[PDB]
Amino acid sequence: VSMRDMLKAGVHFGHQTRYWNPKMKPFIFGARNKVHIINLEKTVPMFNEALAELNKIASRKGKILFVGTKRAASEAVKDAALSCDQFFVNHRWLGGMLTNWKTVRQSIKRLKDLETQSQDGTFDKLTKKEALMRTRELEKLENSLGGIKDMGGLPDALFVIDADHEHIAIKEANNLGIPVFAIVDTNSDPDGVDFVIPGNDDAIRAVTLYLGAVAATVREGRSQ
RNA sequence: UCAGCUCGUGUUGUGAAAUGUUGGGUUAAGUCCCGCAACGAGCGCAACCCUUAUCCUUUGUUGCCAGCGGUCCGGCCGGGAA
Numbered sequence: 001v002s003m004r005d006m007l008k009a010g011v012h013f014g015h016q017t018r019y020w021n022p023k024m025k026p027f028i029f030g031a032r033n034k035v036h037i038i039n040l041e042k043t044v045p046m047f048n049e050a051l052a053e054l055n056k057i058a059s060r061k062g063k064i065l066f067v068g069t070k071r072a073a074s075e076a077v078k079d080a081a082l083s084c085d086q087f088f089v090n091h092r093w094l095g096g097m098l099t100n101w102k103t104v105r106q107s108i109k110r111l112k113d114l115e116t117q118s119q120d121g122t123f124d125k126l127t128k129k130e131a132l133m134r135t136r137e138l139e140k141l142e143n144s145l146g147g148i149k150d151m152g153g154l155p156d157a158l159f160v161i162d163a164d165h166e167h168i169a170i171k172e173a174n175n176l177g178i179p180v181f182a183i184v185d186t187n188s189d190p191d192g193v194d195f196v197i198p199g200n201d202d203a204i205r206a207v208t209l210y211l212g213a214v215a216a217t218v219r220e221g222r223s224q
Numbered sequence: 225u226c227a228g229c230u231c232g233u234g235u236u237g238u239g240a241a242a243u244g245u246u247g248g249g250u251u252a253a254g255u256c257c258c259g260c261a262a263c264g265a266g267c268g269c270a271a272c273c274c275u276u277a278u279c280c281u282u283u284g285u286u287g288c289c290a291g292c293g294g295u296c297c298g299g300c301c302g303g304g305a306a
């Protein structure tokens with residue numbers, strides 16, 4: 001992607017100056033109307049490198065986990081992960097999804113053993129109220145684990161929208177050595193991210209631009 | 225007979241420990257929902273047990289007497305299964 005595409009989407013629009021993290025100072029171009037403007041001259045070469053490294057991991061048959069539970073990037077993280085056949089978390093990240101994977105697994109199993117029952121017909125059997133409490137455990141397990149049900153283990157990379165909002169996921173990945181790619185706005189701390197991509201993480205326009213180019217370089221990375 | 229008491233893994237703290245189990249509502253209830261660095265699990269709560277309140281089906285004596293038929297007026301007798 002190029003500098004003009006980032007502009008029309010609003011990638012260069014940061015937060016108000018009073019909310020900045022001073023560690024973001026190198027990636028800042030200036031301020032306009034008391035709002036920080038990210039330096040797109042750095043967003044481009046840093047994203048391409050992130051797009052380059054994501055390509056290699058996909059070529060080696062790696063698993064990419066897309067994390068974005070904000071109400072702006074929620075439904076797009078799921079669309080980008082599917083059109084790419086990888087995995088995603090787009091509702092509240094469960095603390096310990098990765099560092100406590102050996103426990104969160106048993107909830108993936110329960111999600112499977114309860115979906116085959118939705119497909120079997122055991123819900124037409126139960127005493128109504130018992131089938132109704134089981135169809136509700138389904139939707140809850142689906143909303144939280146529906147994107148990682150086939151992951152079958154720790155992923156090899158994480159792509160995150162908003163490093164601050166998903167600070168727990170990033171900490172879990174650093175804990176296990178899993179490389180973190182993340183969009184980092186001006187109010188966020190870039191110290192945990194291995195591949196920083198400074199850019200607006202709130203506008204739906206900019207998010208889709210990030211997710212499209214990443215979903216592309218992994219589809220191409222899985223072909224070769 | 226009060227609704228409590230804990231553990232595994234994870235995470236936080238040099239540590240004793242903490243979190244979960246707190247919060248917003250709700251319930252007889254740590255009851256349930258929602259939120260949530262927690263995710264799950266156990267012992268308790270509830271349910272499963274006995275009894276009581278309504279109805280059905282079967283069975284009809286030592287229990288029963290609606291319609292019958294007699295009568296010493298006693299279901300007493302013949303019967304009747306209501």
Ligand SMILES: [K+]
Nearest residue numbers: 237238239241
């Ligand atoms: K302390």
Ligand SMILES: [K+]
Nearest residue numbers: 233234243244
């Ligand atoms: K513990």
Ligand SMILES: [Mg+2]
Nearest residue numbers: 236237238239
């Ligand atoms: Mg320690």
Ligand SMILES: [Mg+2]
Nearest residue numbers: 228229245254
């Ligand atoms: Mg207690």
Ligand SMILES: [Mg+2]
Nearest residue numbers: 242243244245
């Ligand atoms: Mg405690």
Ligand SMILES: [Mg+2]
Nearest residue numbers: 246247248249
């Ligand atoms: Mg409460």
Ligand SMILES: [Mg+2]
Nearest residue numbers: 254255268269
């Ligand atoms: Mg309980």
Ligand SMILES: [Mg+2]
Nearest residue numbers: 244245246260
């Ligand atoms: Mg809680």
Ligand SMILES: [Mg+2]
Nearest residue numbers: 268269270271
């Ligand atoms: Mg009880």
Ligand SMILES: [Mg+2]
Nearest residue numbers: 291292293294
């Ligand atoms: Mg008579």
